[PDB]
Amino acid sequence: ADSTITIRGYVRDNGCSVAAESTNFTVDLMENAAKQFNNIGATTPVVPFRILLSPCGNAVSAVKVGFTGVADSHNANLLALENTVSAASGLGIQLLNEQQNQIPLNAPSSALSWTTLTPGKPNTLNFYARLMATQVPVTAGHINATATFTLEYQ
Amino acid sequence: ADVTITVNGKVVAKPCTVSTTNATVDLGDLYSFSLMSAGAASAWHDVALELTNCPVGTSRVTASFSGAADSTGYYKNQGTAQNIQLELQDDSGNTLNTGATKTVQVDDSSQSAHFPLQVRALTVNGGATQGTIQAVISITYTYS
């Protein structure tokens, strides 16, 4: 104690590193050269796509999720594609959760649910999506679109 | 030699002056995101210590540490946050434990010396709690 030594400080909180998954489409007129099926034509091999909910904070524990996109005209619960001459015709994209249940588009925050999290240790969302032949039939073309996920926090 | 005379003596070293007594550095506040892995640590930070005005013959001084370490051997935080330990070494990269000691030389001319030392912090187990941070260490000296 002839000399004295001191450090002070705090910890700053940090959010979640969020990594996505881009899915190519390679179905290539299996569904559409065969069908010729009604506007409920969501016969399409779904893809489990993941969200890397890692790393995160600690008090980060339960949040609210949500999605925006161009609602298809026939079913607003389908994603319309990009308005392209090189595209297909008569399709709308259906989202499915990890339990394979169709997800409501553009729903307000009042209906949302607290996605409970694992503090510290990593998490990952593993969902599905498919193509629903709205018009009968579907002509060939490109399958291009964008969508948006927003998370409102804890 | 008509008469021969025997003259004797001894010189012993006295306390010098300090230059200071009052080291304190805050480092700002960061992320247990960035400190998530077990055994993650901070960035080092410099500290120099002088002691001046030394009596004649005084050549070497041992520095004698003191601090509150936990069972890691690294120093326990006294702030509210947890899982967090402290890291002082020399600039020869050698662990400065509580109670420990280190002798250095003294410059002949300037009657003084300095202490090139480095400090950072750490987690051991990773994923520390969030809160406040407090740390105080003491040091005495012996002379040579």
Partner: protein, 778 residues
């Protein structure tokens, strides 16, 4: 799955891990699909394979069809051409750069070639009641100069008291990167590794540790195993998962994480994907002389001797040191000393037994020629035991003993000029001991002792300390005892002393803006067993905002023993100006009355001029952002820019990343940057610029149309007038800055169409932000 053998365009994986997509030729052979590719070693080294990790591969050709499943064990290839992949399973030892936090060294900086001064004057004046006044004058001097890697340093001083130069210290040095090492010419001192620290002038070539990822620094036991299939191993210690990873199949080893022998021992738990776990535990203690295996530490030292005694000689010499890590805890090491009247040779091994605590014994023999030409041989031996932490909070930190013959002496014992340093009473043996004990939660006791025997005289020098800490949660209880005793003199050398420290923040509002949270006091006492009981109170802390100036106040009282009672007094202020640092101290103790002053600083000869500022540490970054005036560099104390727009930081780690952050709130209303954060990896002794694109001028949002439309999104804009350039938001909006008041604008999105033009009224000047709307050319 399966296509017939032949050449395919296929996404090459490696345990599902994509590398590239090569046309690969297949043959009816041996895999999961009955087919083998013809791969080249040039492909595989371009794929992740350490080629020399598999022996027998250098003797192959460059492009011969690699028999990998046979030459390499636990190695499978599997094609899946339904998805066109090649899932490859390899034992991990055949890859590289698995050091977490690896840095490629070609990313390292040389720096600039530039000069350097570092000065300091200081001094005091004392008034004596008997004798009067006393005035002292010492200026310090540290220059340097760097060209690429040529690192030249000199220090010296000037003197005057109530009176001249003295040349002190100089060296030029340079590293070699593939040799991983550092050579220096000039003044130097040796290292206390096997032998003793020796000042000299010469050549000194040493392996540098500080290139390592620090996960390699320190010893860790290197862990071997073989995975059957893909597994995941968790590793624990003290109940904490100290390591986890999923692991591929195959033999493997572990060169991993920072060690802690006083964390207990290792809790290894190997979950193969079946669920079967391969459990054992791993011991760990350490010698401070250990090497992690594969490392090899060395130095090559030669030159002429330097001391500082007139009564000696300065001859030429040589000395060599070398160490290399070994299997099974064994440890070779060795250097030797080769000089004129003299030769000296060590012999080695130390070892960790793991279960029994680490231990080392070594022995050196030397040949000597005394200045009366009596020539002798001798031997010496040393013994060092370690035992780590037990469950009872107990650590054996060091056990040390050394012994030598009568005929054993040192090279330093020889160096002299005239004959008759009392060499008839060399030491026999030396004992030292280091153990503490964890005391529950809120206490700790430290225990140290050392012991020293001599040939000839019957006198032994000993040293002892016991130090105890208790903390009641603000309250710092300190109680320690000292006891040494010495041969050349008489008296039992002891002291007992105590302290409690108290802070002031722990009583007030933590968000009160009082400086009084940054203040504290303490009170201490002691007694000598010999009359003198003494005590001390001290109140100290920080000051105005940056705490660059700060205060210390104390006094104590002395009593007993000699009848020299007395009060004290010390008051000291230290300020750090941006140009350099300066303080004034004061003592009064009633006979003693004295006053303390001193100013340091550092000077930079660079290409853009000369920079002045605070003291220096060995590697400094230039801050280049012209136009800055008073710039808070974040987490940096006393660090601002000049009136020009430049600054420096001496603060440096190296071979490691460093981060440069700036306050916006300290900025002026008219200049902008793009990223206030920079990052470097420097080497040792270098110089970095911190360049930042400043934008001086007026700051402005506009919402612009053309063809009665907000023009399409994300287009590119430049100023014709200024250099500044912009990117179009929605609604025909773009923010820009660094601008003049009147002018013209070029905009490209298709083929460049739009050209706008403008003039704001000048009264829009006390506003940082202005807004308007207009149209284009096209």
């Amino acid at each position: 799955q399966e296509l017939p053998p032949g050449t395919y365009r296929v996404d090459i994986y490696l345990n599902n891990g994509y590398m590239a997509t090569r046309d690969v030729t297949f043959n009816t052979g041996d895999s999961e699909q009955g087919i083998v590719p013809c791969l080249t070693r040039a492909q595989l080294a371009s794929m992740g394979l350490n080629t020399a990790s598999v022996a027998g591969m250098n003797l192959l050709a460059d492009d011969a069809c690699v028999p990998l499943t046979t030459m390499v064990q636990d190695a499978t290839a599997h094609l899946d051409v339904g998805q066109q992949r090649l899932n490859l399973t390899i034992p991990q030892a055949f890859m590289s750069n698995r050091a977490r936090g690896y840095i490629p060294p070609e990313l390292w900086d040389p720096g600039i070639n530039a000069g350097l001064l570092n000065y300091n004057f200081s001094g005091n004046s004392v008034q004596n009641r008997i004798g009067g006044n006393s005035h002292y004058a010492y200026l310090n001097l540290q220059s340097g100069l760097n060209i690429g890697a040529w690192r030249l340093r000199d220090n010296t001083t000037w003197s005057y008291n109530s009176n001249k130069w003295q040349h002190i210290n100089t060296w030029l040095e340079r590293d070699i990167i593939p040799l991983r090492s550092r050579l220096t010419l000039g003044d130097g001192y040796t290292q206390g590794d096997i032998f003793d620290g020796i000042n000299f002038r010469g050549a000194q070539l040493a392996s540098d540790d500080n290139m390592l990822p620090d996960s390699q620094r320190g010893f860790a036991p290197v862990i071997h195993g073989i995975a059957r299939g893909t597994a995941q191993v968790t590793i624990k210690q003290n109940g904490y998962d100290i390591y986890n990873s999923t692991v591929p199949p195959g033999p493997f080893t572990i060169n991993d994480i920072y060690a802690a022998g006083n964390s207990g021992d290792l809790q290894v738990t190997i979950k193969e994907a079946d669920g079967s776990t391969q459990i054992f535990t791993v011991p760990y203690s350490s010698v401070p002389l250990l090497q992690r295996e594969g490392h090899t530490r060395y130095s090559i030292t030669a030159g002429e001797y330097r001391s500082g005694n007139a009564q000696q000689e300065k001859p030429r010499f040589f000395q060599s040191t070398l160490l290399h890590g070994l299997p099974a805890g064994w440890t070779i090491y060795g250097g030797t000393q080769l000089a004129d009247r003299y030769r000296a040779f060590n012999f080695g091994i130390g070892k960790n037994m793991g279960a029994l605590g680490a231990l080392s014994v070594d022995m050196t023999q030397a040949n000597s020629t005394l200045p009366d030409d009596s020539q002798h041989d001798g031997q010496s031996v040393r013994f060092l035991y370690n035992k780590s932490l037990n469950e009872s909070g107990t650590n054996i930190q060091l056990v040390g003993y050394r012994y030598s013959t009568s005929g054993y002496f040192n090279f330093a014992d020889t160096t002299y000029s005239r004959m008759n340093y009392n060499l008839a009473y060399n030491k026999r043996g030396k004992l030292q001991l280091t153990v503490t004990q964890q005391l529950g939660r809120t206490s700790t006791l430290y225990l140290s002792g050392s012991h020293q025997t001599y040939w000839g005289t019957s006198n032994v020098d000993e040293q002892f300390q016991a130090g105890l800490n208790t903390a009641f949660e603000d309250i710092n209880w300190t109680l320690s005892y000292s006891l040494t005793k010495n041969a050349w003199q008489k008296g039992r050398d002891q002291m007992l002393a105590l302290n409690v420290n108290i802070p002031f923040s722990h009583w007030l509002r933590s968000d009160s803006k009082s400086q009084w949270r940054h203040a504290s006091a303490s009170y201490s006492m002691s007694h000598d067993l010999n009359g003198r009981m003494t005590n001390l109170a001290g109140v100290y802390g920080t000051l105005l905002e940056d705490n660059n100036l700060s205060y210390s106040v104390q006094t104590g009282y002395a009593g007993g023993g000699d009848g020299n009672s007395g009060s004290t007094g010390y008051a000291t202020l230290n300020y750090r100006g941006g140009y350099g640092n300066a303080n004034i101290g004061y003592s009064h103790s009633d006979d003693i009355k004295q006053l303390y002053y001193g100013v340091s600083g550092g000077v930079l000869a660079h290409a853009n001029g000369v920079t002045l500022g605070q003291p220096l540490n060995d590697t400094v970054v230039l801050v280049k952002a012209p136009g800055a005036k008073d710039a808070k560099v974040e987490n940096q104390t006393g660090v601002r820019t000049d009136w020009r727009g430049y600054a420096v930081l001496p603060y440096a780690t190296e071979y490691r990343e460093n981060r440069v952050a700036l306050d916006t709130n300290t900025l002026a209303d008219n200049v902008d940057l793009d990223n206030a954060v920079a990052n470097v990896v420097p080497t040792r002794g270098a110089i970095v610029r911190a360049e930042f694109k400043a934008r001086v001028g007026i700051k402005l949002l506009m919402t612009l149309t053309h063809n009665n439309k907000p023009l399409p999104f994300g287009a590119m804009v430049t100023s014709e007038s200024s250099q500044s350039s912009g990117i179009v938001a929605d609604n025909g909006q773009v923010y820009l800055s660094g601008m003049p008041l009147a002018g013209k604008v070029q905009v490209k999105w298709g083929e460049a169409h739009c050209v706008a033009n403008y003039q704001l009224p000048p009264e829009s000047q006390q506003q940082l932000l202005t807004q308007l709307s207009a149209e284009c050319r096209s």
